[PDB]
Sequence to fold (309 residues):
Amino acid sequence: LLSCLLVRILKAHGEKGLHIDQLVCLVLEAWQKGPNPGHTVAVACTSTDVLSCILHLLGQGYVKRQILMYAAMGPCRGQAEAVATLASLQLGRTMSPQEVEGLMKQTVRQVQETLEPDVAQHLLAHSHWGAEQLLQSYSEDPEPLLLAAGLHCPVCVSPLGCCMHYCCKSCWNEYLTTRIEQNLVLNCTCPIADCPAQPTGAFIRAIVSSPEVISKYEKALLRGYVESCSNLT
Amino acid sequence: MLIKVKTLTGKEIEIDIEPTDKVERIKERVEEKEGIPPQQQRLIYSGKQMNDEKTAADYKILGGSVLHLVLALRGG
Ligand SMILES: [Zn+2]
Ligand SMILES: [Zn+2]
Fold:
């Protein structure tokens, strides 16, 4: 609720903007009058709350800068009686890699259910683990949102029997080993020209399924998720 | 007829509707307990965004079927 009020307040001022303490004054006054013109929604805010919410917004790239101003590809965040909780004002904690993998897996699973898991992970990576705004664009239009991820054997001149490239597993394994081993598996695609294909890692797991390859792929996904979360370090 | 709306975290809200209710009416009933202007709310059903003008009967919505809420602050 505090964030939505903030974004409306900062949307109202165009490029004129407001000072940081000016924005604080406006949001504090609004909450003092209360977003209630209700009781289900509305506790008393503090400057710490304003600074925390504007930190989240800055992390979402919605505010730019002593000057503070509104804004219009970037990073995202993990995003993971009543008076009893409300009185407890405070809320950073430290995560472990096992917990990180668990939360990332749960999030990708739930967003996949909201709309197959492999395509879900591929699209989430395509947006750099971005918000569901990518899904919002998908609901607006599939085609460009899909295009964001772009969703004798020729390579092995030795002949053998039999994205639109059903090549033998030898050259596919060679390409996958080269990419993963060189730590360049980011944005993997079909080496045949004009074949930008969003790779389902399970299909890539079919290309090569080495136990060291599994460790490399897991470490790579961990690094990629960690580097694209606005709050992680 | 009573249906459900699920936010992103997982919190569920239960709202009774009528076949002639508009998507704007549903958004109003949601913000009754959420206090979020409809400019920021978006409704998703079967992977399709709910058209605000349309009626709840247009999408053939039945009871219990969860219309997934999603936030959109930038827009509005
Ligand atoms: Zn080959
Ligand atoms: Zn190809």
